[PDB]
């Protein structure tokens, strides 16, 4: 497994994932990672992007997801199904995902992580997602639709 749930009192508050050799989790997700190998890692607070990160242990280096900055318009996969990306916006049908789903990765047709979900906005029949993505030059950026609620 490359995604690990985060639980504070036994309920799932969010998910953590290993991307590119780093462990990622949102700042707003409280609790401990079920994997003690990751929970014991001291994480840096990247308040610029609402993400905590650390170095993957050598024993966990094999459980790493590849990422890419090449995210053309189309459909992407995640734990709840397909995700549609257009006009520099990530969108899912309304009711697909909610509180507790932040930190899930979005994968392309080759299994490469293209984004990490932080939250979203319900726009009628579709829900727009707040995601952390890399621009056309591969630089990490945070995309936040106005009024997005952290999940």
């Amino acid at each position: 497994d490359k995604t690990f749930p985060i639980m504070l009192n036994g309920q799932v508050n969010g998910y953590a994932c290993v991307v590119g050799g780093r462990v990622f989790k949102p700042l707003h997700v409280e609790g401990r990672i079920d994997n003690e190998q990751l929970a014991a890692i001291k994480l840096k607070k990247a308040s610029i992007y609402d993400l905590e990160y650390g170095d993957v242990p050598q024993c966990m280096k094999s459980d790493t997801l590849q990422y890419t900055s090449d995210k053309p318009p189309g459909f992407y996969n995640w734990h709840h199904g397909a995700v549609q990306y257009e006009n520099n916006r990530f969108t899912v049908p309304r009711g697909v995902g909610g509180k507790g789903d932040s930190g899930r990765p979005i994968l392309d047709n080759k299994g490469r992580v293209v984004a990490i979900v932080l939250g979203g906005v319900n726009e009628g029949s579709r829900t727009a997602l707040s995601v952390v993505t890399w621009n056309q030059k591969g630089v990490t950026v945070k995309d936040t639709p106005e009024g997005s609620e952290p999940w």
Partner: protein
């Protein structure tokens, strides 16, 4: 004394030089920090746009 002493009467040229360096250096160092903070904010802005 036939004269009148003032607050700055005793401050020598070397004393003013050190005061200017200490005041100027600390002020310049503060401005460097503020400028770098503002410049990086623009760098991050261009990253999103």
């Amino acid at each position: 004394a036939q004269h009148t002493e003032s607050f700055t009467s005793a401050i020598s040229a070397t004393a003013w030089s050190w005061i200017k360096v200490l005041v100027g250096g600390t002020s310049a160092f503060i401005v460097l920090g503020l400028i770098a903070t503002a410049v990086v904010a623009l760098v991050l802005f261009f990253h999103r746009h």
